[PDB]
Design a protein around this ligand. Structure first.
Ligand SMILES: Nc1ncnc2c1ncn2[C@@H]1O[C@H](COP(=O)(O)OP(=O)(O)OP(=O)(O)O)[C@@H](O)[C@H]1O
Ligand SMILES: [Mg+2]
Lengths: 61, 884, 30, 58, 397, 34
């Protein structure tokens, strides 16, 4: 009862012909750390300076 | 910004009070201000008053702080200040500008008090001081009705302003002094009544029709009770005597509306004058078809006031109305054909095919055919169809069928002394109990207000009034009760007081005896009162509870006590309050029945507050029934102003949301409330729609009946179509529903007949006409009266009926054929003009014709002008210096 | 002629003075 | 509601946008003090525009 | 069928001078209004009536579901399935459930359908889309035949057409003539056409349906003829009824070969109206009344004698009708005694009833201009040309 | 046919059960000549 059924599903027969089973995502630490590489930028952009001319234009704006 | 050109007014009429000490300047400036305010308010027709607007603001401070003025002179300078302060009364002062009147124009009078007012057209102290003597005088008469001299000098001031209102402008304010007298002099109304009496009756003669119309319309809807309703009723009594035209047959009217006062007022308004009796006063007698006692008062006991003493009595009773009606039917308007039941029961061409026989001589249908035949040819001496050769026809019913068929046969020859008894002589020796009782009913039926000198009903029924047979007693007592509908002579009382006081008679017999005696006497009859109450006390609980006829005993009591106010009803409630819970029904019957026309809130406030809504969720049966039936009693015709929202509160509230047993048949009230035939108003929607809804049996049967009201002469088109929509095509299979359908929707064909209790003039009801109340309680009961054939005399009891014909005579006979103008009613009388009751011609019938209430006639081209001006179906085209 | 707009005093006086004594109760009741 | 079609609120009365734009929300800046002549015309316009609205009692 | 409608309150105006006779009458009216209010309030205060059937009703509702979409039963098949068109216009072959009143299913009646798996689950006899509901008169107009001055022949004809048949019609089949199905009012503008319609709707006893003519036209394809059909279906359903189509020339113009889809739809709407006017028998108690100024521009098939027999002409008021109108519209005024009113009526002009009313209103305004309310003759004199704006002199002399 | 109907109408107008030649004449004056 932690999550509420939706009106759309309810009209289409939820709780009358079928029940919604709570879905839980088994995600261990290994898979999490590997998925974290999708947006882990690099060791480089942590040292890569932004363009100084673009920096000045951004600062002026 | 101001006018600038006349900017002297915000200077000179401003500096004169501003500069205001020196007494000479005070007097001079007060005189100048008087002159200026007079010259402005009196002739300058501009509503705006230059000083009055420019005196204001300054006036409420200067003329208020200078109002004391220390009374420098004795009163003359104080008179000047009061004359000045009586100018800015409307807007300068608060709502108690009537207090401004008290201490500025009531405390003092500037010589002729209207010296600066009677000159003013209506405003300064006529419409204004009229407002103040109908507001200040109203509150003071409410709180200090008998005050110090502040109530008598104000009374005389009201007197002169009231009469000046007739002779200061001579304009349509002639409708405002009656207004003032109604409002001014709230408790001393009669003082102002006599004031306008002595003023108007001597001022000018034409300026009194407006007086009469004003007081008449107020009589229709006066205050709640007859303490000033009675006083307005008495107002035209000076306005009808020799102070105006003496003929004025409306004496019967303003005696009828006040309790039908014959032997206190009619003794003087017609019984004492008796001087122009050869004129329309004889047709005043003719148009007085309720109170035979009135002419018995002089005629019989002296027989010397005029030669037409007993001949005039007899002719206006029934004989010549019958003769001229027959002339209208055969001699003049040829609509007198042979019209039995069959000629129109199968008026539909649908009944020819699909029957496969279906021709049954059963009791219900044969009974309905007999009732229909009797109703259709009512007062017809020509229905030799189911009468002579139809002895077996009278035989071919069930037991009550004989009594009802014979009563219907008697009804055929309505109010006919010769023909009626020469046709009932054959059936008098009927040689059968039930037919014999029907024969006594017929004998008591040809005495419908006939007031026969020979009194055939009394002698012819006295052998059976107490005879040991229930049907004999029923027929005899019902016939005698119908015979003596008008008077309450001590012979019939001493005959039936033993009868209804007899324990031999059954409670159906006791109830019908009560109905009889109740429509015998319409006054007190303390013998009848005590007898009925000691009945309701000596009866046993079950009998007085669930007899199915226990209604008729309080019904007889109320019918006796109908019309007169709650005076007798107070003690009647006192000694019925000690009774069984059925006394609730008994009280809510008799009390409200004591009001025929009493259009007021408080009584219907009890009916719709304590009797309706304090009974909606309460299952006390038949308490709500009389409640909603008499919701239109005391409201049957307050000029029909109180009838239309009666229709609204009934259809919208009662029928739609009422109880299935106590209020779902709140529908015969529609029969009583207004009966002419009006779609969506009385007949089409409220009756036809609930009639198709046959879900409730009693509702459907009673609702089909309720068209009986309009059925006096509905011009059956669009009503016969209803019947054919329900005969064969509707509630055909339901035997009892079809029976009432036949009876009710088919007794329309009775031509030139009218069941409405309200009289031809429309401003008076007819108590004898209102005795069609027993076939309302009985008709609602439906158990052993209508749906069950226990007793059908109540359906016979409809001989409270008048012709709807027209006719004109000139001291001799109906031979006059002056053109008439019958058409629907319009505005008249109390408006700017008495526009004729017909807005145009419509029908231009010259011969005597038909006139239902939404068809009233006017004279033509001024030939033999009738002085009756009432056209009570017997107009007198009395000649004069015609075309002067 | 320059016709003057009715002043507040003029409105107030038109609402009264030239009125029937029953304007108030009639209008309220309706 | 979404697809259960259950009445769950009452909304103000329907005026279509095309005519709701017709209301003069932002009043224009033009006074009678900027109108030369037309005094008679102004009084005539007022006797129909504002006199019935301000005071129908007369 | 059920009965007519248009309940109105009491005429009053028995007095009009506020001489307290108006006060007693309005007091009676208000008191009885209070009685109705108290009665219905106290009825709903104690009115316990519910449930009863419940579980059977509960399960039939459960079968019905929520929402239930209304549809128009276009056609019926063997009595378990039918053809019903949804309000979108798409129509489906659906099943009819057991609990529906097979007698009630008739082509045209609104039928309740299941939202999913469409099926006839109920019948609505009171669909009455808001447009046609609005087109129905509820509070009858306050005008009356007393308010109409002149037009005696016009009032007489209109009453013979749309009052006499509803009241006692026995004369009509006594003489063998059919009652006049439909009457049309025409004449110059402001002569008393719409006023006569109001007056008829006042002293009426039938459902009065006021129509603008141009209201019948609708944007979406097929909405126009559908609206006309629904309007006349309501008229028959609430018979007897009067259908008043004001400004009939908004659609009644000359029929011509349509090219654009909108013109085709207008022609279709008029064809539907004409077919519907043919559809109901003249013996039927539904009458139509149409008014227009440009009578000549009407379709000469809308005014066919077999369709609209009567044609009531409304000429510009004559001198006697002008004086009647002036009496009517100056009745409420507090006219001074100097006013004659005959000079204006004399002036040979095209004063209409509306023009007379405007002249009176302008005279009152001019009296207010002089701070007075007595309204002299000079005020009328100036008001006449104030309202009447706009043959070269000696041509025709 | 409309002329005959109008003649009946004129007869009803005078509340006569029988139409006269005069009614037909005024009816044809009404319908014919528009
Ligand atoms: N005979 C008349 N008696 C009294 N008032 C009349 C008369 N004829 C017209 N009027 C007045 O004219 C006013 C406007 O008339 P109405 O609305 O009937 O116009 P119409 O002739 O139907 O014209 P249109 O339909 O072209 O606008 C009404 O409010 C009414 O006061
Ligand atoms: Mg119009």
């Amino acid at each position: 009862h932690l999550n509420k059924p939706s009106i759309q599903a309810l009209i289409h027969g939820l709780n009358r012909h079928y029940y919604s089973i709570t879905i839980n995502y088994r995600k261990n630490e290994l898979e999490q750390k590997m998925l974290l590489n999708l947006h882990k930028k690099s060791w480089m952009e942590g040292l890569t300076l932004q363009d100084y001319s673009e920096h000045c234009k951004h600062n002026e704006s | 910004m101001e006018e600038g050109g006349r900017d002297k007014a915000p200077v000179q009429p401003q500096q004169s009070p501003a500069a205001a000490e020196k007494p000479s300047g005070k007097e001079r400036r007060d005189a100048g201000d008087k002159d200026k305010e007079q010259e402005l308010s009196e002739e300058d027709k501009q509503l705006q008053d230059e000083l009055e607007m420019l005196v204001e603001r300054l006036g409420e401070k200067d003329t208020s702080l200078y109002r004391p003025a220390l009374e420098e002179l004795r009163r003359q300078i104080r008179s000047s200040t009061t004359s000045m302060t009586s100018v800015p009364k409307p807007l300068k002062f608060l709502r108690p500008h009537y207090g401004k009147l008290k201490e500025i124009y009531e405390n003092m009078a500037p010589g002729e008090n209207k010296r600066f007012a009677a000159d003013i057209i209506s405003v300064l102290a006529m419409t204004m001081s009229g407002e103040r003597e109908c507001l200040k005088y109203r509150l003071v008469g409410s709180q200090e009705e008998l005050a110090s001299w502040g109530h008598e000098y104000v009374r005389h001031l009201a007197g002169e302003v009231a009469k000046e209102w007739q002779e200061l402008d001579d304009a349509e304010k002639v409708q405002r002094e009656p207004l003032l007298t109604l409002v001014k002099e709230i408790v001393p109304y009669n003082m102002a009544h006599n004031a306008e009496h002595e003023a108007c009756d001597l001022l000018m003669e034409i300026e009194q029709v407006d007086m009469l119309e004003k007081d008449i319309d107020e009589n229709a809807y006066a205050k709640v009770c007859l303490y000033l309703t009675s006083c307005v009723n008495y107002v035209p009594e000076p306005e009808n005597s020799a102070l105006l035209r003496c003929a004025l047959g409306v004496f019967r009217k303003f005696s009828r509306f006040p309790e039908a006062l014959r032997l206190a007022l009619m003794l003087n308004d017609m019984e004492l004058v008796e001087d122009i009796f050869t004129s329309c006063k004889d047709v005043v007698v003719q148009k007085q078809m309720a109170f035979m006692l009135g002419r018995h008062g002089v005629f019989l006991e002296l027989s010397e006031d005029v030669e037409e003493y007993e001949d005039l009595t007899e002719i206006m009773s029934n004989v010549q109305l019958n003769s001229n009606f027959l002339a209208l039917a055969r001699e003049l308007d040829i609509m007198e054909p042979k019209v039995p039941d069959d000629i129109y029961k199968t008026h539909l061409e649908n009944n020819r095919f699909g029957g496969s026989g279906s021709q049954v001589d059963s009791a219900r249908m044969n009974l309905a055919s007999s009732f229909v035949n009797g109703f259709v040819n009512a007062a017809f001496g020509q229905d030799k169809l189911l009468t002579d050769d139809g002895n077996k026809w009278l035989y071919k019913n069930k037991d009550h069928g004989m009594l009802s068929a014979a009563a219907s046969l008697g009804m055929i020859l309505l109010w006919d002394v010769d023909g009626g008894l020469t046709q009932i002589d054959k059936y008098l020796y009927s040689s059968e109990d039930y037919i014999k009782s029907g024969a006594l009913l017929a004998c008591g039926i040809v005495n419908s207000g006939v007031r026969n000198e020979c009194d055939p009903a009394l002698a012819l029924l006295s052998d059976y009034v107490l005879h040991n047979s229930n049907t004999m007693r029923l027929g005899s007592i019902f016939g005698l009760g119908l015979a003596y509908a008008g008077s309450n002579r001590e012979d019939v009382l001493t005959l039936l007081l033993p009868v209804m006081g007899d324990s031999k008679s059954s409670m159906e017999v006791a109830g019908v005896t009560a109905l009889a005696c109740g429509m015998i006497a319409v006054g007190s009859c303390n013998g009848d009162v005590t007898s009925t109450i000691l009945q309701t006390i000596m009866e046993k609980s079950e009998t007085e509870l669930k007899d199915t006829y226990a209604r008729w005993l309080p019904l007889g009591l109320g019918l006796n006590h109908l019309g007169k106010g709650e005076a007798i009803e107070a003690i009647l409630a006192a000694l019925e309050v000690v009774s069984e819970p059925f006394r609730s029904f008994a009280n809510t019957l008799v009390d409200v029945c004591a009001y025929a026309g009493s259009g007021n809130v408080l009584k219907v406030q009890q009916l719709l507050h304590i009797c309706s809504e304090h009974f909606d969720s309460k299952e006390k049966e038949e308490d709500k029934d009389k409640k909603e039936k008499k919701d239109k009693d005391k409201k049957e015709a307050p000029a029909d102003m109180g009838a239309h929202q009666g229709v609204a509160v009934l259809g919208i509230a009662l029928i739609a949301m009422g109880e299935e047993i106590g209020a779902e048949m709140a529908l015969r009230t529609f029969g009583h409330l207004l009966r002419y035939g009006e779609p969506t108003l009385r007949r089409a929607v409220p009756l036809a729609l609930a009639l198709i809804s046959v879900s409730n049996p009693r509702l459907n049967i009673l609702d089909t009946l309720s068209k009986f009201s309009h059925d006096a002469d509905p011009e059956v088109s669009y009503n016969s179509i209803f019947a054919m929509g329900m005969v064969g095509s509707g509630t055909n299979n339901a035997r009892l529903a079809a029976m009432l359908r036949q009876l009710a929707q088919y007794h329309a064909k009775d031509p030139n007949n009218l069941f409405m209790v309200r009289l031809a003039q429309g401003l008076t009801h007819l108590g004898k006409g209102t005795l069609t109340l027993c076939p309302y309680h009985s008709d609602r009961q439906l158990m052993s009266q209508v749906a069950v054939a226990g007793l059908l005399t109540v359906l016979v009891s409809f001989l409270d009926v008048r012709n709807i014909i027209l006719g004109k005579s000139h001291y001799v006979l109906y031979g006059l054929v002056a053109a008439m103008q019958p058409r629907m009613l319009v505005t008249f009388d109390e408006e700017l003009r008495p526009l004729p009751v017909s807005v145009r011609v419509g029908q231009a019938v010259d011969v005597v014709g038909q006139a239902g209430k939404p068809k009233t006639i006017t004279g033509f081209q001024t030939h033999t002008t009738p002085v009756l001006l009432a056209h009570g179906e017997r107009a007198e085209l009395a000649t004069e210096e015609f075309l002067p | 002629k320059p016709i003057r707009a009715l002043d507040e005093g003029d409105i107030a006086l038109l609402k009264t003075y030239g009125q029937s004594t029953y304007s108030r109760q009639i209008k309220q009741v309706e | 509601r979404n697809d259960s079609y259950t009445l769950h609120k009452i909304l103000p009365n329907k005026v279509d946008p095309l005519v709701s734009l017709m209301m003069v929300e932002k009043v224009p800046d033009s006074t009678y003090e900027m109108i030369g002549g037309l005094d008679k015309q102004i009084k005539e316009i007022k006797e129909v525009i504002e006199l019935p609205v301000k005071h129908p009692e007369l | 069928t059920k009965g007519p409608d248009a309940a109105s309150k009491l005429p009053l105006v028995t007095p009009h001078t506020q001489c307290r006779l108006k006060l007693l009458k309005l007091e009676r009216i208000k008191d009885y209004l209070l009685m109705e209010e108290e009665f219905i309030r106290n009825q709903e205060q104690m009115k316990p009536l519910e449930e009863k059937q419940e579980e059977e009703r509960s399960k039939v509702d459960d079968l019905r579901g929520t929402p239930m979409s209304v549809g128009t039963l276009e056609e019926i098949i063997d009595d378990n399935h039918a053809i019903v068109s949804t309000s979108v216009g798409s129509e489906h072959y659906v099943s009819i459930l057991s609990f529906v009143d097979k007698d009630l299913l008739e082509p045209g009646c609104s039928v309740l359908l299941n939202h999913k798996v469409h099926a006839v689950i109920g019948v609505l006899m009171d669909d009455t889309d808001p447009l046609v509901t609005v087109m129905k008169v509820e509070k009858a107009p306050q005008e009356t035949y007393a308010d109409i001055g002149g037009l005696d022949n016009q009032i007489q004809e209109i009453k013979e057409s749309v009052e006499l048949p509803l009241t006692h019609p026995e004369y009509y089949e006594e003489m063998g003539i059919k009652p006049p199905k439909g009457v049309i009012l025409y004449g110059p503008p402001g002569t008393g056409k719409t006023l006569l319609a109001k007056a008829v709707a006042n002293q009426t006893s039938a459902t009065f349906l006021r129509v603008v003519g141009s209201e019948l036209i609708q944007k979406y394809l097929g909405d126009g003829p559908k609206l006309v059909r629904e309007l006349f279906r309501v008229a028959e359903e609430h018979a007897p009824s009067i259908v008043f189509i004001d400004e009939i020339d908004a659609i009644g113009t000359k029929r011509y070969d349509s090219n654009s889809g909108g013109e085709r739809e207008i022609q279709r709407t008029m064809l539907e109206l004409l077919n519907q006017l043919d559809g109901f028998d003249s013996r039927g108690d539904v009458k139509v009344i149409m008014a227009t100024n440009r009578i000549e521009t009407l379709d000469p098939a809308l005014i066919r004698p077999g369709r609209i027999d009567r044609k009531i002409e409304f000429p510009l008021p004559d001198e006697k009708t002008k004086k009647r109108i002036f009496q009517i519209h100056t009745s409420r005024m507090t006219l001074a005694d100097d006013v004659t009113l005959d000079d204006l009526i004399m002036a040979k002009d095209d004063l209409s009833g509306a023009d007379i009313k405007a002249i009176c209103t302008e005279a009152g305004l001019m009296a207010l201009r002089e701070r007075r309310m007595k309204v002299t003759n000079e005020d009328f004199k100036k008001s006449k040309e104030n309202v009447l704006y706009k043959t070269p002199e000696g041509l025709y002399l | 046919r409309s002329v005959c109907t109008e003649a009946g109408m004129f007869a009803i107008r005078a509340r006569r059960k029988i139409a006269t030649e005069k009614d037909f004449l005024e009816a044809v004056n009404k319908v014919i000549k528009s």
